[PDB]
Amino acid sequence: PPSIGIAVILVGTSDEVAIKDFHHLSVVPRVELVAMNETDPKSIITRICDLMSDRKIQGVVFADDTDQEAIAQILDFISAQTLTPILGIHGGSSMIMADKDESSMFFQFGPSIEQQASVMLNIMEEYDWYIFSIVTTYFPGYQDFVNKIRSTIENSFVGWELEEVLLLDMSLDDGDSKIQNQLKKLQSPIILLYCTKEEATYIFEVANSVGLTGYGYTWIVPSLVAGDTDTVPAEFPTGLISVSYDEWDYGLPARVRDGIAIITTAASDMLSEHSFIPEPKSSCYNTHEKRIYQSNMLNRYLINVTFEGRDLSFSEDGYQMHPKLVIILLNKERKWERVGKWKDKSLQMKYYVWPR
Amino acid sequence: DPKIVNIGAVLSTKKHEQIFREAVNQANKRHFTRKIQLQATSVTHRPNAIQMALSVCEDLISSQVYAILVSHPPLTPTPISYTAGFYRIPVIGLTTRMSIYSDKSIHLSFLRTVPPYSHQALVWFEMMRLFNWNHVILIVSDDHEGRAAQKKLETLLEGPKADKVLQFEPGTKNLTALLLEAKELEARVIILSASEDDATAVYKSAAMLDMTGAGYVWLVGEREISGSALRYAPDGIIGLQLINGKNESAHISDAVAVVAQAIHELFEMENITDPPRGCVGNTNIWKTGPLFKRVLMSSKYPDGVTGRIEFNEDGDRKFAQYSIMNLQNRKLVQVGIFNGSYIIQNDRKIIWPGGET
Ligand SMILES: *[C@@H]1O[C@H](CO)[C@@H](O[C@@H]2O[C@H](CO)[C@@H](O[C@@H]3O[C@H](CO[C@H]4O[C@H](CO)[C@@H](O)[C@H](O)[C@@H]4O)[C@@H](O)[C@H](O[C@H]4O[C@H](CO)[C@@H](O)[C@H](O)[C@@H]4O)[C@@H]3O)[C@H](O)[C@H]2NC(C)=O)[C@H](O)[C@H]1NC(C)=O
Ligand SMILES: Cc1nccn1Cc1cc(-c2ccc(F)c(C(F)F)c2)cnn1
Ligand SMILES: *[C@@H]1O[C@H](CO)[C@@H](O)[C@H](O)[C@H]1NC(C)=O
Ligand SMILES: *[C@@H]1O[C@H](CO)[C@@H](O)[C@H](O)[C@H]1NC(C)=O
Ligand SMILES: *[C@@H]1O[C@H](CO)[C@@H](O)[C@H](O)[C@H]1NC(C)=O
Ligand code: NA
Ligand code: NA
Ligand code: NA
Ligand code: NA
């Protein structure tokens, strides 16, 4: 069978041996594990572009050890510019990237903005936490976060009360104490925060000054704010609740296996139906000339892959369709603790009475 | 020996690079530069977006630029905005009029010396107050641009009212269903927002439905009286042209004046850090980026070549000047100016579709 080149890019300390641990499809994968030390735009662009010139790269599987959401953005850009599938399977590469390019072939192992907002409301209905406020930054997806909450709350016969919706500008200096003034408006026992991990550290520092992080105030945050659970910023408040992707049972060697399976199956299926697959781009520096000879045709296949009887499919926004989410709580020892599971649109909490 | 502060630029040609180099030199001459002295660093646009993103790193961020000026090429400012925005290095759009660059959420540190096409609603509104068009029909393309114009006009209206808004799919050639809706209505003042190719399709359909004659008024922007849109445009149409909108030399001159003043105002403050030297290994934002953005957003340069320079909440140019154009016997005639805040009608008489309403 024909051979497709797949680059597995690993940023940070990882067991390549454990990762290196079957496909009887129309095409076969030629996997090359690649190390990368830096995560700036130049480094990522250069690494991928160099790999594409050397081998015939059909798709990329990317994993990183960082809390850098901008990695998803750099990858989306590369993917759309070179019409090459890139899968963000771990780290900042899997952090929500709202409004991916029209020409994007970038897919992420992680929950969408909408699913997380939905999970958040399920946690609230469980403990009868109906009175709340929303705080977001301009981090892309904020509009999607607020709208999902709003639409849900509107079409529900439950006594939901959305007190305030704050929008904070992080792009300017806070020499005027605007954020502080805005945060002072907050009176709700529950606060839904949608922003980045680096933005949350600032928000929380100010929220504390205004006495909004203690007992009586519960902050619920998305996956990206918690980021890497081993990096707990000092300013994060004790009792912080977050949604997390299963880092416990869905390990890195499994994700790499699944990444390879998606690219290989999608290629096999396209070849089986059209008697061709896309020719891997020889260069990044001819994208302008060559674009009438290229398309994102493989997306119709990458979005719908099934392997070992597992529905590996993706949403129209390039996020995993059916993830197992974990509900985490930042304890008194400043360590993240598992307090719930989000399975088959069903939430299963550890506690009936939420503890202090 | 002063501290050298680099200013970057992505310009169209080597002539324009020499204009930037000269504008920075004159800045150094006109200001007190014993403490801080500017240095011009520039490149021309690269053939593709990846090459451009790379060039921003390799040629500009490598030189520790405090800001990057960007002209629309002879391909967009997006890869420059994205790469510099990663570090929170402010970007100054000199000629880009697309509304999408006003979105703070995706263009993280971006200002422009030209307003977006949606700000043409400010002129239309003033035109409506002046000619007492209390009932209008707004036809917009169902794209970011079309919707940005609608959002902008609706804000000003909320006296004169928009009886109905009609959106169409970009690229649609048979618009007679949309225009038949508009014909049924009492209002005979039509405001259009569409690209050259889409404006052409509206004009062709409207002429077929005999809607480009007496009793009708067409109020349009710049894109709709440009290129092919002009070939099929009804006579009597009123459109706009942003004065100096396309003069990259004038915008280099004014952006450098604004940036130079902002740099000197910034160094009046304490704990000013340098931007990162190069991209490789640098993944944190420039800590002085947000303060420098605030200093820029609030800069006022009254004696600019393109006028009074100030920026709005989105860092878009305020007090922009427009030529009020009128298509008379298939010639574009200037009938007035929107000076930044007021309409000034010249001695050339408006000919409405037909004669005089
Ligand atoms: C775009 O076009 C507009 C419209 O003309 C310009 O705005 C006007 O600019 C002139 C000149 O700068 C201003 O004139 C000054 O008006 C003062 C009184 O203004 C009041 O009354 C007027 C008329 O009713 C109102 O429009 C206005 O809101 C005020 O309530 C006078 O006191 C001034 O006189 C003094 O200064 C002049 C020199 O400037 C001397 O000659 C006099 O001797 C005297 O000392 C003066 O006449 C006018 O106020 C502005 N109008 C508005 C609406 O703001 C814009 O400047 C122009 N923009 C650009 C970029 O060109
Ligand atoms: C967050 C989001 N949702 C929808 C759009 N965006 C913005 C965005 C940023 C970049 C990006 C960011 C940094 C960087 F350095 C580069 C360089 F690689 F081109 C690109 C690429 N694609 N989209
Ligand atoms: C990354 O760091 C290790 C440190 O020993 C080095 O061996 C490796 O070559 C570095 N990677 C690159 C791309 O230079
Ligand atoms: C997904 O894949 C299956 C094959 O397992 C195929 O039969 C089906 O048509 C695909 N679904 C969609 C929605 O395209
Ligand atoms: C462009 O601007 C410069 C001044 O900045 C001027 O010399 C030149 O005449 C202007 N061009 C046009 C076409 O008016
Ligand atoms: Na193409
Ligand atoms: Na001097
Ligand atoms: Na802006
Ligand atoms: Na006139």
Author numbering:
A (entry chain B): 32 to 52, 59 to 393
B (entry chain A): 23 to 96, 102 to 185, 209 to 407
Wording from the paper:
NMDARs are heterotetramers usually associating two GluN1 and two GluN2 subunits. Crystal structures recently established the existence of a "phenylethanolamine binding site" at a dimer interface between GluN1 and GluN2B NTDs.
As for MK-22, the structure of the GluN1-GluN2B NTD dimer solved after soaking with EVT-101 appeared almost perfectly superimposable with that obtained with ifenprodil (root mean square deviation values for any pair of structures ranging from 0.3 to 0.5 Å). Although the hydrophobic ends of all three ligands occupy the same pocket at the NTD upper lobe interface, the remainder of EVT-101 occupies a solvent-exposed groove (or subcavity) departing from the phenylethanolamine binding site. Conversely, the proximal part of GluN2B-Q110, including the backbone carbonyl and both Cα and Cβ, lines the binding cavity and provides multiple interactions with EVT-101. The backbone carbonyl of GluN2B-A135 is also ideally placed to directly contact the imidazole ring of the ligand through a hydrogen bond with the protonated nitrogen at position 3 of the imidazole ring [experimental pKa = 6.86, measured using methods described in Shalaeva et al. (2008)]. It is noteworthy that EVT-101, unlike MK-22 and ifenprodil, makes minimal interactions with the lower lobe of the GluN2B NTD. Van der Waals interactions between the ring of GluN2B-P177 and the distal imidazole moiety (including the methyl substituent) were identified as the only short-distance interactions between EVT-101 and the GluN2B NTD lower lobe.
